[PDB]
Amino acid sequence: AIKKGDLVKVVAEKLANSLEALASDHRYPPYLFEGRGEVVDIRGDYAQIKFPVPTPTVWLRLDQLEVAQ
């Protein structure tokens, strides 16, 4: 459903249970939930998200992502 190149937002409930929560901090930064990250290079079940903050991009699951219209 989630294409390559549309604005997505991260859901907090499906993120802090899985394997993607071990790499990061538990206190999640607020730029994930403001829906502005452009998803590029979907690879199977996972997706790289270019968030508007000048930090490295993250790879999250496509189940952990909600489209921000």
Place this chain on the structure above:
Amino acid sequence: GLLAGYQFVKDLESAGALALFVPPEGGFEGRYQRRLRSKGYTTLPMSAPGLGDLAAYLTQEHGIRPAHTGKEDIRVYFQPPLVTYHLENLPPNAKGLVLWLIDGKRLSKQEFAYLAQLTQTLPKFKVVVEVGGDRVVRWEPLADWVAA
């Protein structure tokens, strides 16, 4: 010479658009924007290559596009017009402001003359464009410097 008075402030009220010729090792230009700042004139030292079109920067608002750096959209930051935003914050009990442009020697003559004819059409505002170099710091109006 060495003991400088306040003739630099009186020449700026006369001409309105000066053109300093300072020593290129610096340190001797700024002693004349202290005599300028002692007489109530505030000072906005800007950089002459950093300005774009001086009409669209000084008296008009300009859309400054910041570095999106590949992780941001094309934002347009509309900054206020520089000489007429620093005039309104300047209180009316003090005198005007001066534009202390440094590295004026990379400005074209069309941008020299635009800074010359603006200081009289805009009240309580002057410019000092630091252009060129000389062994002794000296000034002249911008009206005949473009006539050189």
Place this chain on the structure above:
Amino acid sequence: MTILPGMTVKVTNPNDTYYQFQGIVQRITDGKVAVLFEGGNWDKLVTFQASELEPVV
């Protein structure tokens, strides 16, 4: 001769770092002309004093 913005000139004076380099001029001004030299990898334009630039056909 006069210089229009886009003709191929080459430098003629010997007291200069760019002795005989040639290229397209760009953004002629009231006393100065910048000549894009087309040199190798990174194209470089250098200011001159509107003289010592003999063009070729």
Place this chain on the structure above:
Amino acid sequence: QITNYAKEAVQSAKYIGQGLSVTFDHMRRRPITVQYPYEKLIPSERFRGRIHFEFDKCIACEVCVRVCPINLPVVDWVFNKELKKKELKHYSIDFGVCIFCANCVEYCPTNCLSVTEEYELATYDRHELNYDSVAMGRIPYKVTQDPMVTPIREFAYLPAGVMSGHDLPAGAQRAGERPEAIAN
């Protein structure tokens, strides 16, 4: 004993005697130094000073963004469907963010972007370095066309044999560009 301190002192007090002589002979040589604001040293033919810009040449294709290491140059363009050709409306390279690697002047088809020779850009404000398209299109400052600077040349530009740029009355580079066109 007493017959040793007149012989254990000579072995190095004459070595500093042959060391005070060589350091005094270091003062015999001319000071090879580039006094900056009165002798600015001439940059090379490939030096990446700062980027120039031609607003009448940039056809809005963002190759400069895709080859930049940080995707720095802001290309503001509309599509302009009445003419069916994209025409830009603003261009800016925020220097200070700009590493002067000049990938944009290399991968450009229309030869718009180009490196200048001026390194003398230093502002009091970080945002005064965000150059406009008409601020980048200004004419560079040449070291030779300044009546306060005696421009001394660089190494690999002197004639063959001399390794200094001060007592150089004339000359050129140590080779010829086209010497062999009527020879061979």
Place this chain on the structure above:
Amino acid sequence: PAILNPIARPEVPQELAENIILTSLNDVYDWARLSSLWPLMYGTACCFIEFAAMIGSRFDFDRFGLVPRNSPRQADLIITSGTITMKMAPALVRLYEQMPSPKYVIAMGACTITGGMFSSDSYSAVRGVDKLIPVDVYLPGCPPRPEAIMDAIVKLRKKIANEHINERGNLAQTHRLFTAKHKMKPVPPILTGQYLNAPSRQAPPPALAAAM
């Protein structure tokens, strides 16, 4: 609102009246600071070699009056020559507070202005030294030429002469202290001063040397 990040109107009149005598003493006050200011021998990344090439013989450091000091107290100028990460970010403020108040930090290189090439995607780089300490003169370049640093010294020297002797009060820090009590668990420090004499380097532990 009306204007984002506004400029506060200076309500003070700045009655900066002075005679011929006091400004003649202010010229000597500013000349003595612009003409013999001592930079700290500081350098982190690549811009320290371009700064150390200016110490040498081809470009003269001690020609404007610049003497490099390897101590924060004796130096006033600090040329931030190098990319500062999350580490060196508390260390550079500590080098900055241990200075007499005419400081005049100048940023050198692209990575002390906006964190230049690591401003796109880097998890530990502070983007610009002006997120930690106030900067007088900015200097782009990567790396700047040693001639280009001596312009930034010249641009700095023009800024010392603008400083006034009766405006010496804003050079000291203001102290708006606030206090809150927390309930965070204190942690023992990670980096204790033993490396070789730690009780894990002398021999491999059991339940791991059996399969060796």
Place this chain on the structure above:
Amino acid sequence: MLLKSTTRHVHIYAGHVVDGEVHPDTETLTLNVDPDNELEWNEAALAKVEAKFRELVANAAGEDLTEYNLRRIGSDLEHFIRSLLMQGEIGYNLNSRVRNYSLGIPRVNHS
């Protein structure tokens, strides 16, 4: 040890200050906003960052007392002072010797 979080506008130390000399404590955190006078404050917004400083200290009072966690509090205060500039509550100081505009330039709202 003096765990500290020193950005430009926020100096959070792990301890209390007795007349300049900072003494490292375990219970308290001291904060002085804007050591350099870059922003001209007022009585209203200085209490507004106290509605943010004591909020984040009470929120993060279940975590560890490290330099990483003091930096997380000192960052969110520095993101709160920048929100006070974009709301036009405080403004830039012009009596300061530097005018480098660390928290963005002045700009008008909606062109």
Place this chain on the structure above:
Amino acid sequence: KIETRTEPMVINMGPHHPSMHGVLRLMVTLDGEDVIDCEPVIGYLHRGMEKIAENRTNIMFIPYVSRWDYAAGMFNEAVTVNAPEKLAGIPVPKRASYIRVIMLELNRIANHLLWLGPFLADVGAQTPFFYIFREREYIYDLFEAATGMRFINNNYFRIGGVAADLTYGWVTKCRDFCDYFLPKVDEYERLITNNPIFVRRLQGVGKISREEAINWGLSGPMLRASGVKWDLRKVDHYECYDDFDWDVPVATEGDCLARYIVRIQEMRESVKIIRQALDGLPGGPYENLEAKRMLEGAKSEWNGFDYQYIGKKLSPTFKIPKGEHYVRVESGKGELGIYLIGDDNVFPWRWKIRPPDFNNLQVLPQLLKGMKVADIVAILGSIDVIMGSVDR
């Protein structure tokens, strides 16, 4: 306040560290005059270089790489462009290969000269520190002519070869430089071998055996100064370095005096490789290469796949092919390797820089065992460290 106790005193070298080899922090503890332990705190220049490359194309990452070993410069660009050109099988022309040997041997001279100046001031005499940097300024202008920058940020190495050919008065200007610098190499050697006060600070001070050097992991003039004779330009047949005759400088002593004489002998052998490459150049000088381009421009022995600076000027959208890789380049400081594994897109999947100084700094606690306090910067100045390579 400060008290006087009887336990061993721990001093912090501090991240300030007024030296020219980066920003270290040694928590070295003292036993009166002898050290007993020392932990190095690194990471003060960790800008996240490996995470950057996973969002960079190769032409977008070529400016990033000459900041790890910023004394060297193009030694970092050597490993970078060799990672997809040895994986995609892209042929490098023979002339562009010899320009790479010319540029890398000039970087190793500049790598060793930046090592030499601070090392001579740390071991004693401070007056050659100003005369060595003058000799490095000649190497700056040789790169400033050919590339557009002095010692780093010189995007010269490409995937299909090199960025551009040399300038006109360039090949005759090593013959002014590297025929003048080579008399001064023996002048730098006679500073420490003669005046026998410097040998009492370098004989046996920081000695490492041969068997411990291979186990702890060492490369370049720190491994070879224990009597190993391992050089990756000889071991790996790397880009027409095998077309020259040059001896590998070995010193079977292990001490810091052996590390001094090897690095001085690496300067001397580099000029040998330079002069064999300036005369062994395929088209010779560029002003004479371009001369044959006009007399026989249709189809000659010149204008081939060789005698030119690039094979094919590749697009910015050059996809790295799929496969693991590990390319090695013998730098001036050791083995600088990168472990490239890339997917079929333009970004590599993992870019693990294996630095030459990250693996040589882990021996510094073991070398500082029994050494004195005045011989701490004498050890650290002889590892030839650049922090930025260690921390990335």
Place this chain on the structure above:
Amino acid sequence: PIVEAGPVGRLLQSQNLSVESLGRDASGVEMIKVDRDRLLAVCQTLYADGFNYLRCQAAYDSGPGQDLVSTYHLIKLSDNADRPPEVRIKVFVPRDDPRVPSVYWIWKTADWQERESYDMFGIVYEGHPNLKRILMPEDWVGWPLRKDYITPDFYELQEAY
């Protein structure tokens, strides 16, 4: 099987240490998969064989949510060689429980290199002396260079505004 062995894989087969031999490299070295329980048995045989020099102990992520890899590119160093035999041992480890046994006692070059594998990636090395963070602050909590590392909203890490 599907993929044949090589010169190092046939040596480990002759010592009753079954290893999942991968194919050749893109440069031409042997890639060998060893489980984390049989790592110290394999590397003790290769060190006695002659592989006295380990380089680039590289932790590598196979993708987000996949198994982490700790690679060991060990070469046979001699006094003078001409392309000596090398082999890369890759040890796959899951995201949860990322433990690989340390090879510091075999090769001392895996002290800081395994710290860099623990500083960036979450791979905890059992038996490793002084296993801490080198490249980062020691009180950092996240694991960068993983594909999943969400960088915190620090004021210093933002744009210059």
